[PDB]
Write an enzyme that holds these catalytic residues in place. Structure first.
Site, PDB file in Angstrom:
ATOM      1  N   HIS A   1       0.818  -1.220   0.000  1.00  0.00           N
ATOM      2  CA  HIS A   1       0.000   0.000   0.000  1.00  0.00           C
ATOM      3  C   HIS A   1       0.853   1.271   0.000  1.00  0.00           C
ATOM      4  O   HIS A   1       0.361   2.355  -0.323  1.00  0.00           O
ATOM      5  CB  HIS A   1      -1.009   0.006   1.157  1.00  0.00           C
ATOM      6  CG  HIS A   1      -0.404   0.292   2.498  1.00  0.00           C
ATOM      7  ND1 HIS A   1      -0.194  -0.687   3.446  1.00  0.00           N
ATOM      8  CD2 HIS A   1       0.026   1.451   3.052  1.00  0.00           C
ATOM      9  CE1 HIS A   1       0.348  -0.143   4.522  1.00  0.00           C
ATOM     10  NE2 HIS A   1       0.487   1.153   4.311  1.00  0.00           N
TER      11      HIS A   1
ATOM     12  N   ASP B   1      -0.688  -7.499   1.026  1.00  0.00           N
ATOM     13  CA  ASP B   1      -0.121  -6.186   1.332  1.00  0.00           C
ATOM     14  C   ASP B   1       1.321  -6.307   1.810  1.00  0.00           C
ATOM     15  O   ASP B   1       1.629  -6.200   3.000  1.00  0.00           O
ATOM     16  CB  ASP B   1      -0.981  -5.417   2.338  1.00  0.00           C
ATOM     17  CG  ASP B   1      -0.561  -3.962   2.467  1.00  0.00           C
ATOM     18  OD1 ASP B   1       0.223  -3.485   1.616  1.00  0.00           O
ATOM     19  OD2 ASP B   1      -1.023  -3.290   3.414  1.00  0.00           O
TER      20      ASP B   1
ATOM     21  N   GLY C   1       2.502   6.735   9.168  1.00  0.00           N
ATOM     22  CA  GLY C   1       3.949   6.834   8.994  1.00  0.00           C
ATOM     23  C   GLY C   1       4.672   5.585   9.470  1.00  0.00           C
ATOM     24  O   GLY C   1       5.842   5.378   9.137  1.00  0.00           O
TER      25      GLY C   1
ATOM     26  N   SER D   1       3.337   2.444   8.964  1.00  0.00           N
ATOM     27  CA  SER D   1       2.977   1.309   8.123  1.00  0.00           C
ATOM     28  C   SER D   1       4.138   0.866   7.234  1.00  0.00           C
ATOM     29  O   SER D   1       5.043   1.648   6.931  1.00  0.00           O
ATOM     30  CB  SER D   1       1.699   1.576   7.328  1.00  0.00           C
ATOM     31  OG  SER D   1       1.937   2.405   6.215  1.00  0.00           O
ATOM     32  N   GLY D   2       4.125  -0.408   6.863  1.00  0.00           N
ATOM     33  CA  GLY D   2       5.258  -1.008   6.173  1.00  0.00           C
ATOM     34  C   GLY D   2       6.352  -1.479   7.116  1.00  0.00           C
ATOM     35  O   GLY D   2       7.203  -2.270   6.723  1.00  0.00           O
TER      36      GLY D   2
END
Ligand SMILES: [Cl-]
Ligand SMILES: [Cl-]
Length: 248
Positions: free
Chosen positions: A41, A90, A192, A194-195
């Site tokens: 994403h 994702d 901020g 995420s990932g």
């Protein structure tokens, strides 16, 4: 990260910052000399590869460190199954323009096997440079934040997300996802983050159990962070890393 604490420099040496046009947008995890794992994403197809950077070996983002290293990307590979926001798959492999050299501040996190299980209630850690409270950015010099979060099954998580749910904000925790956090408010990932990594301790080691997939809840009650299970992609990751391995 809201309700966490500042990590110590080098404590989470797989944690990277991913920027687009110079601005931090997501976290990621170093997994080999040339590969970073993040969330699909974070990488819309319309964005240009050459506008991204990966910052490794950092603690305080705005502070200069001789230990930190910045890279560009040769490739961005979202899992082919990833469709729209909220869909399965994702996860994304990011190929650094050149391989980096490992140091005490820059180290890969071990990946779980396809069949690796992490039990409900295990105390894992989520890390990142995202907001420290809703709509409130981490202040300069931006020390890396950490938060201990217990694992929550996707089934419990789905029922929690259905409490006071809004049709304008649909959520579903997919079969390749797990949650982590608290039923009560105040302690979770924020915009901020995420990932970034969900790092779990098992038999003296640390594993990349999860990749922050939905981390914008930022401590709202009944909204624990949603993570893509790295185990669901062990086969795909090994295939890609092996086929594309560089000369030593
Ligand atoms: Cl590699
Ligand atoms: Cl369910």
């Amino acid at each position: 990260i809201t309700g966490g604490s500042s990590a110590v420099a080098g404590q989470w040496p797989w944690q990277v910052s991913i920027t687009y046009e110079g601005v931090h947008v997501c976290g990621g995890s170093l997994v080999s000399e040339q590969w970073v794992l993040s969330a699909a994403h974070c990488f819309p197809s319309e964005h240009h590869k050459e506008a991204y950077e990966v910052k490794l070996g950092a603690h305080q983002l705005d502070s200069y460190s001789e230990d930190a290293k910045v890279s560009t990307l040769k490739d961005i590979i979202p899992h082919p199954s990833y469709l729209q926001e909220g869909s399965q798959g994702d996860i994304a492999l990011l190929q650094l323009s050149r391989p980096i050299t490992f140091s005490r501040y820059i180290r890969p996190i071990s990946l779980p096997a396809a069949n690796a299980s992490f039990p409900n209630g295990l105390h894992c850690t989520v890390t990142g440079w995202g907001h420290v409270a809703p709509s409130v950015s981490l202040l300069t010099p931006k020390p890396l934040q950490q938060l201990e979060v217990p694992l929550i099954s996707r089934e419990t998580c789905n029922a929690l997300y259905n409490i006071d749910a809004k049709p304008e904000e649909p959520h579903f925790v997919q079969e390749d996802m797990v949650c982590a956090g608290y039923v009560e408010g105040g302690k979770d990932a924020c915009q901020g983050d995420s990932g970034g990594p969900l790092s779990c301790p098992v038999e003296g080691l640390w594993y990349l159990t999860g990749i922050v997939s939905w981390g914008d809840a930022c401590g709202a009650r009944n909204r624990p962070g949603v993570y893509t299970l790295a185990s669901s992609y062990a086969s795909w990751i090994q295939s890609k890393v092996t086929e594309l391995q560089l000369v030593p």
